[PDB]
Specification:
- The structure is cut from a larger assembly and holds chains A (265 residues), B (134 residues) and C (158 residues).
- Chain A is an alpha/beta fold and 265 residues long.
- Chain A is built from nine helices and eight strands.
- In chain A, the strands form three sheets. In chain A, strands 3-8-6-7 form a four-stranded parallel β-sheet. A two-stranded antiparallel ribbon of chain A has the order 1-2.
- By secondary structure, chain B is α+β, with helices and mostly antiparallel strands.
- Chain B has four helices and eight strands, in the order ααβαβββββββα.
- Chain C is mainly alpha-helical.
- The radius of gyration of chain C is 24 Å and the shape is flat.
- The chains are: A alpha/beta (265), B alpha+beta (134), C mainly alpha (158).
- The interface between A and B is small, with 5 and 4 residues.
- Bound molecules: magnesium ion (78 copies).
- The site of one magnesium ion has 3 residues of chain A, from loops.
- Chain A binds five RNA strands through helix 1, helix 3, helix 4, strand 4 and helix 5.
- Chain B: It holds the Pfam family KOW.
- Chain B: One of its GO terms (biological process) is translation.
- Chain B: Belongs to the universal ribosomal protein uL24 family.
Chain lengths: 265, 134, 158
RNA sequence: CGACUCUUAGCGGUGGAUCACUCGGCUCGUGCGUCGAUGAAGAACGCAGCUAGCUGCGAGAAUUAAUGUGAAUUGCAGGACACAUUGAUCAUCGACACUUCGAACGCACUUGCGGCCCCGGGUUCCUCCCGGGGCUACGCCUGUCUGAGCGUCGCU
RNA sequence: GCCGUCGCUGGCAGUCGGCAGAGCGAGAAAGAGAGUGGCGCGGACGCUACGCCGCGACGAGUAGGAGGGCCGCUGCGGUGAGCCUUGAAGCCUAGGGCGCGGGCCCGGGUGGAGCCGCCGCAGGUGCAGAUCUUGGUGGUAGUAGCAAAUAUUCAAACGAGAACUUUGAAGGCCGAAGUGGAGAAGGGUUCCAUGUGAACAGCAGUUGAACAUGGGUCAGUCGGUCCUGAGAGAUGGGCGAG
RNA sequence: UGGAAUGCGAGUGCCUAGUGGGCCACUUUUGGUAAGCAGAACUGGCGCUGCGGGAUGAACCGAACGCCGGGUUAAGGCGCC
RNA sequence: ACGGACCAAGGAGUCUAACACGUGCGCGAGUCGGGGGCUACGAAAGCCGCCGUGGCGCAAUGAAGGUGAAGGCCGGCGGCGCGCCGCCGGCCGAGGUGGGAUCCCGAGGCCUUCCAGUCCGCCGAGGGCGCACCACCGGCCCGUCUCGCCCGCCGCGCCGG
RNA sequence: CGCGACCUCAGAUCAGACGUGGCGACCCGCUGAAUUUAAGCAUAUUAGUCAGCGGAGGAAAAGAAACUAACCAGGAUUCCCUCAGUAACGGCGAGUGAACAGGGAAGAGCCCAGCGCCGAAUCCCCGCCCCGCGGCGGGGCGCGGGAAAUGUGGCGUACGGAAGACCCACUCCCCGGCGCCGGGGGGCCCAAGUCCUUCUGAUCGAGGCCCAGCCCGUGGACGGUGUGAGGCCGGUAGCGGCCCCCGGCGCGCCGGGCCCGGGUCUUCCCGGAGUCGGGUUGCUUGGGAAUGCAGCCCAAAGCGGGUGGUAAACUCCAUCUAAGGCUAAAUACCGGCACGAGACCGAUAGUCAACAAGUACCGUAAGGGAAAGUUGAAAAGAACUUUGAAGAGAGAGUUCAAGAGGGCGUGAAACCGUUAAGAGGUAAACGGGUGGGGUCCGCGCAGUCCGCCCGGAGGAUUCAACCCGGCGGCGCGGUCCGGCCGUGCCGGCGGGGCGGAUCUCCCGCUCCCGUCGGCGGGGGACCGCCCCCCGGCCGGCGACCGGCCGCCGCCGGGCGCAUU
């Protein structure tokens, strides 16, 4: 409150009365009389630099960068090492990316959804979300944040014909409309490599949504994939190649430690 | 997950409305499940506990198979008093212990005109949803 | 105090500017409200166009903008007179009227006169009494195809 | 020896920090956006079987009626020929009710003085006394009634 | 000897293995070059390259600057198939250790319901001071003090209990401008009866103006009520943004 | 024949805090009887700095500092403390 | 010299705006949707492209009216007397000097029994193209001054170049 | 003198109405500082801001040009973005500071006086009759009263309007009643474990619940319940169910009102005065020879007047039409009623106020104004015995625990009592160095472990090599077959999308006589790019594989039966 600590008529007694010069409450007959006020070192006073509602809570991020961030997330989502390293149990999914037929877009019952995840071997990831359900340490419990769990697989669909309702009650699952992908969902916590599951229709719109290298995006007015700074990231193939290996001087791997000086005299 | 914009899941709002519930609401809150026999017969799962019902205690120190009659629905304290569910004070007199209605099972319902009206409505609503899934 | 090279700045914060800060935390809630009033209005006047009355073409003033045209307030009495539309009947059938505007040159006058005639050619007019058509009303066959229009009517383009 | 003093530790006090909790705040957003002479806001004083405060209510006073609800309220007691269409309790709230002051209104602010009309009891029609009921404030608009003027006129 | 800093913008992708051949520190340019004619199945560690290794020099610090913190605090997104009623946080500890340090780990005890590690995000984030704020506690200290207005004593009663209460008897004082009997203003139940002796009455108390439970103020004639005083104050009127 | 010796890697650009009371000593030096006084030059100090010595001490003399072992010193010392 | 008897808890460079430079990322002569609109977490996220209006940048200079960012060579003609100016057609062309990381050529030279002469490498006097950057000298655009001769025309001018 | 009209003005407890006061976050009209900055201070700034006064509503105000402009023109008001920290103001210092155009949100326009014409065609009130009657209205009747010619109603208002004539075309538009038909508020309800072992004071904990995977799930929000709960309860999900009430939108009947329009000609008519403008004064603005407002003086005109950002004269242009009025929306909202949320605070924090808080208490008063949360799962809140006058104790009992005993969760520090140990004349404390003693720890006290080898005792799912099967790695298979496949290159009658400031028979509207041209709207060709199809070269398969063959390795099963 802009009033916190200021709803009094406190006034400094001045010097000469053998007390600090902090402004003091007026009147008498109660405990509050003669106590310190206002200052941030006082009990019941006004804090230092009171917080303001016009703190700059919101940030602009360039569209070109936000789209970049969605391409990085999708690229990372297709590498087993990164999806494993994100904690997902995808040790038995048949392939990455995992593309399922468009029939799953029309499911209605949660049991159809649970059964599919068990046949795709995405159910060990669900069971890890159940095992990670627990209480939150700290005041978040007092503030409608009592329970915490880890994110599960992400299900990406082209059109919702009951897939959202068929999946929404399974803990950890997040649905995403392929034409409205979100970085906060594809990279929870800021870390790339969330395990995702595509329907066929969703998987076939990615080229249109973000364009290939040869063909600009069709569903974005002017966009194309971000160019590669380094085309061959296999540093070991590059270094071991004959061409580089002919230009190098022989390695100097002999270690010349310090010689203890003995007196020639 | 809850989607109704006008239903709060706030912890403190929900607790204030529980502990300040008016009597006719505390009644609904003070509901008990039915035995497997009663559940099958009436196609109802839970009933608002009432005086002269006969219940089993299924949790706590006084749990067991002893069927006792409900002798008092102390709504202010959110507890019911049951026959033989009691103990002694220092001076040796006997005093009832308060069991929460949610920790008993109703084995016989004190039936009258209004209880039957309540029972039929709950089953009629249940059967409607049954035929919605079919 | 100034310190080495720097711009000389004159911030306008010598009043009680904190008493009159206008935050924008209701912006998304304003945008929803405005949209929800556009939808309830589109339903209310359907099949009439949601955008509203058809606006005319006008050339922007000044030498900085006179190369461009845009949508004006409403068609002028000379324009409506040449197009054979009564000024009081114009608003009833989706046409906007601007008694203030003057036609200085013919070509601009003609452009709006033709715009009116094109609009009158696309107008699908429902009879006042549905069971009792009248002289100017559209045939029953072309009333089954009457659907509400989205966006400005006959958009103006440079 | 031992008192006394110091340091450390165990236990016990003084004290109420810390931690955990939160029917309270604060901030943002949304819908509505409603007081009063038909007496508002506010104030005073009363009202419970046992009740000081908080709370609610107004001499019908921790409430009446009605509707919904369907067996309590509960600290103790009690049960009206209270309690299952002879409806406990709670909720709702459209019927009825709403002491004194207060713009506050018969005049004044001391529970001080009237006046007008009607009614009832005193006695015994009038008076007179007692009691009750209704009126009796300022400004202002429309109309009404009653008037004023060596204001302007007409007929006498 | 060891720690760190700085420099060498030093070295290591050559772990090139039986599809093999181990080197390039050496005073002094550039190829351990390529050719054409005249039995066993074996061989340590390394390389979070933001990592590892080597060699040389150096190291004072207020005001001030910068770097790194696997220093610490609270909340948010991820993650730890994390911990926890077979015991969380907190608190205590002549227990065992780690780190230059900020600090941290483990043992034991108490406690009774939640907490923490890592990658990021955020901040109302680190106290010895400000005659700092609020709260608590010391020494001083069983100390200053309980000294203005002449004064008490004897016997009995109740009572666990008596210098202080009550009754009796003495001796004294106020000395009718009173320490007497009544009122106005103010107080507001302090009045009266009975009970208690926790707190209060700066010792005590069986007592009290304390506390507790109940009572008590009766009018034509006593005042108010009425009059007007100094004055205050409506309407008419005047002023006045109001 | 990079045209004296000696030593040393240089150049360059942005942003920048604190400071803007000083004080002391050899030598030189103004005012003053003089002052642990006031005011200057040069260099070095104290301030910001510990350490051995001057018993004691801001500045004197020696010497400047990571945590240590051995050796040797400086200025100063070696009756006893 | 001043504050400090003791203990706990609280306690002081924050947030908004503007600017400067440094660093990181995106795109790049462009770039930015921040306002608007479309389509539980979500008040988020996604899209617009005839929503880029607009901001900043891409042009400076002057008070302003305003103006507003390389040249040379060849041939012919005209005026003056081989040279100068005005006018016509063809050729080349965004300066140069010094330094300058890197790059390039290569006299000579890098061995094995001995001669010849090859393929790939590698060192190298000397010589080149020279990035950025700096110093210097030219040039171009706007204001002003001095000198001076011409060229244009629907307006023959107190015109314009 | 008297009577009677009107005018002006009075009195009524005359009949019927209306205003007053409060709240005030947002709004409108006034009045209005000084702290402060200028490193002093006086203009300036603070600031048209605090304080003061008045008046409202759900919004208020504003608002349909006496506007902006100077363009090829725009076209009410309000709000957002930008214009723009700009034009401008300013001891030209400190500082201050708009508008037009442009893009959006929203979008709505209208009415008088006057000039006229209509027999005042107009209105209010009273009584009776019919309908309705908790928004007091509609119709019929009254030689019922009144207002109104000092001007009510119809037409009509600057976009022009009226009247007459000729053409053309017209039947639904509303008002009061009456009946029938398809969003909002309130109530009641609707899935699934208290299954089996088990820890516990109690558990919602842990393990299990056949192939499959306890059961529901459009419900795994939240809260309660003796931990910690999708399944025990309430709820949560659901274009879920039922029941009441209000509303809205439609369809018919009765009685009413309106007797309604457009084009062209002809004749007519047309505007707001102590206001504008001017002078001066004071305030105000960015507004500068004066932006706006006000006082005083002067005081208009009618092809006039206002504006056209430097005073003034002459002159052209442009542009509006002042001095009367109404008007939703987009916009504002720290008060109110009712809700939802939060990277917020967590009892010295967060509101002063988590609680009998604007309370106790202080002040004559205006005013000032706290402290203060927590036993336990459940009161099971300690019967009874005994000492004491009692407070207090000792036993006993409840509880998992009183080592939780009614200001009781935990229970720190300072400070204090006591027990134990050590020590004590330069106050205590402190750094370095040892020493002695204690508390505990090593859960020490005949002292490590590993590989290979030698030798003794033994003992076996017995080794190598071979055969069968499976799997894997590699192959320059010097050049095996099949594949996808090149951000590769060539040939295509290849079948298409995207873009183009590259060119070009069909159509809509319009100028011209049925003709001929321009705008706008469409094919087609062309070029650049892309995808899909077919043939040829080289090309990957290490972000991208199959079949055979070969080599090697590994495993399973045989056989090897023992100097392994
Ligand atoms: Mg506070
Ligand atoms: Mg914590
Ligand atoms: Mg249920
Ligand atoms: Mg400075
Ligand atoms: Mg009472
Ligand atoms: Mg009732
Ligand atoms: Mg009832
Ligand atoms: Mg009086
Ligand atoms: Mg240092
Ligand atoms: Mg200690
Ligand atoms: Mg607890
Ligand atoms: Mg915080
Ligand atoms: Mg402190
Ligand atoms: Mg004494
Ligand atoms: Mg007396
Ligand atoms: Mg007396
Ligand atoms: Mg005493
Ligand atoms: Mg007394
Ligand atoms: Mg008497
Ligand atoms: Mg009087
Ligand atoms: Mg007066
Ligand atoms: Mg100074
Ligand atoms: Mg000196
Ligand atoms: Mg001096
Ligand atoms: Mg100093
Ligand atoms: Mg120094
Ligand atoms: Mg020194
Ligand atoms: Mg000496
Ligand atoms: Mg030494
Ligand atoms: Mg000595
Ligand atoms: Mg001082
Ligand atoms: Mg002191
Ligand atoms: Mg602290
Ligand atoms: Mg700067
Ligand atoms: Mg930058
Ligand atoms: Mg939200
Ligand atoms: Mg009256
Ligand atoms: Mg000043
Ligand atoms: Mg100052
Ligand atoms: Mg001053
Ligand atoms: Mg001002
Ligand atoms: Mg104000
Ligand atoms: Mg007021
Ligand atoms: Mg008012
Ligand atoms: Mg209102
Ligand atoms: Mg209005
Ligand atoms: Mg406008
Ligand atoms: Mg700008
Ligand atoms: Mg000046
Ligand atoms: Mg100003
Ligand atoms: Mg504009
Ligand atoms: Mg719009
Ligand atoms: Mg008229
Ligand atoms: Mg007009
Ligand atoms: Mg629970
Ligand atoms: Mg389980
Ligand atoms: Mg639960
Ligand atoms: Mg379960
Ligand atoms: Mg349910
Ligand atoms: Mg629901
Ligand atoms: Mg007008
Ligand atoms: Mg003023
Ligand atoms: Mg001003
Ligand atoms: Mg001018
Ligand atoms: Mg208005
Ligand atoms: Mg507290
Ligand atoms: Mg408090
Ligand atoms: Mg507080
Ligand atoms: Mg406290
Ligand atoms: Mg705390
Ligand atoms: Mg506590
Ligand atoms: Mg315990
Ligand atoms: Mg405890
Ligand atoms: Mg508890
Ligand atoms: Mg406590
Ligand atoms: Mg305690
Ligand atoms: Mg002790
Ligand atoms: Mg001792």
């Amino acid at each position: 409150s802009e009033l916190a600590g200021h709803q009094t008529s406190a006034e400094s007694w001045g010097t000469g009365r053998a007390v600090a010069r902090i402004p003091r409450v007026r009147g008498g007959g109660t405990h509050r009389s003669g106590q310190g006020a206002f200052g941030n070192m006082c009990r019941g006073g006004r804090m230092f630099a009171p917080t303001k509602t016009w703190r700059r809570w919101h940030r602009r991020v360039n569209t070109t960068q936000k789209r970049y961030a969605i391409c990085s997330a999708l690229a990372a989502s297709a590498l087993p090492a990164l999806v494993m390293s994100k904690g997902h149990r995808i040790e038995e999914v048949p392939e990455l990316p995992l593309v399922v037929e468009d029939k799953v877009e029309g499911y209605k019952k949660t049991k159809e959804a649970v059964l599919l995840l068990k046949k795709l071997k995405a159910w060990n990831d669900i069971k890890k979300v159940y095992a990670s359900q627990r209480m939150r340490a700290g005041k978040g419990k007092m503030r409608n944040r009592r329970r915490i769990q880890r994110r599960g697989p992400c299900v990406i669909y082209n059109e919702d014909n009951g897939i959202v309702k068929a999946f929404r009650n399974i803990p950890g699952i997040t649905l995403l409309n392929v034409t409205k992908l979100n970085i906060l969902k594809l990279a929870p916590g800021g870390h790339v490599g969330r395990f995702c599951i595509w329907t066929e229709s969703a998987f076939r719109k990615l080229d249109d949504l973000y364009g290939t290298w040869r063909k600009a995006a069709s569903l974005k007015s002017n966009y194309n994939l971000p160019m590669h700074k380094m085309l061959n990231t296999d540093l070991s193939r590059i270094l071991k190649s004959p061409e580089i290996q002919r230009a190098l001087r022989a390695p100097r791997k002999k270690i010349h430690r310090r010689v203890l000086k003995k007196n020639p005299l | 997950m809850k989607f109704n914009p006008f239903v709060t899941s706030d912890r403190s709002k929900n607790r204030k409305r529980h502990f300040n519930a008016p009597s006719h609401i505390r009644r609904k809150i003070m509901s008990s499940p039915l035995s497997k026999e009663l559940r099958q017969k009436y196609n109802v799962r839970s009933m608002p506990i009432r005086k002269d019902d006969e219940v089993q205690v299924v949790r706590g120190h006084y749990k067991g198979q002893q069927i006792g009659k409900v002798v008092q629905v102390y709504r202010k304290k959110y507890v019911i008093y049951i026959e033989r569910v009691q103990r002694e004070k220092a001076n040796g007199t006997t005093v009832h212990v308060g069991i929460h209605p949610s920790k008993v099972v109703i084995t016989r319902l004190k039936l009258d005109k209004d209880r039957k009206k309540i029972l039929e409505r709950k089953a009629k609503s249940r059967q409607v949803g049954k035929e919605k899934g079919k | 105090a100034p310190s080495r090279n720097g711009m000389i700045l004159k911030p306008h914060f010598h009043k009680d500017w904190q008493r009159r800060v206008a935050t924008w935390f209701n912006q998304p809630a304003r945008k929803i409200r405005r949209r929800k009033a556009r939808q309830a209005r589109a339903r209310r006047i359907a099949p009439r166009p949601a955008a509203g009355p058809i606006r005319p073409i006008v050339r922007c003033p000044t030498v900085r903008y006179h190369t461009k045209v845009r949508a004006g307030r409403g068609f002028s009495l000379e324009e409506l007179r040449v197009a054979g539309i009564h000024k009081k009947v114009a608003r009833t059938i989706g046409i906007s009227v601007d008694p203030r505007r003057r036609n200085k040159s013919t070509e601009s006058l003609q452009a709006n006169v033709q715009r009116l005639k094109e609009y009158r050619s696309k107008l699908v007019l429902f009879p006042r009494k549905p069971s009792a058509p009248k002289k100017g009303d559209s045939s029953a066959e072309e009333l089954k195809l009457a659907t509400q229009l989205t966006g400005p009517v006959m958009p103006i383009r440079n």
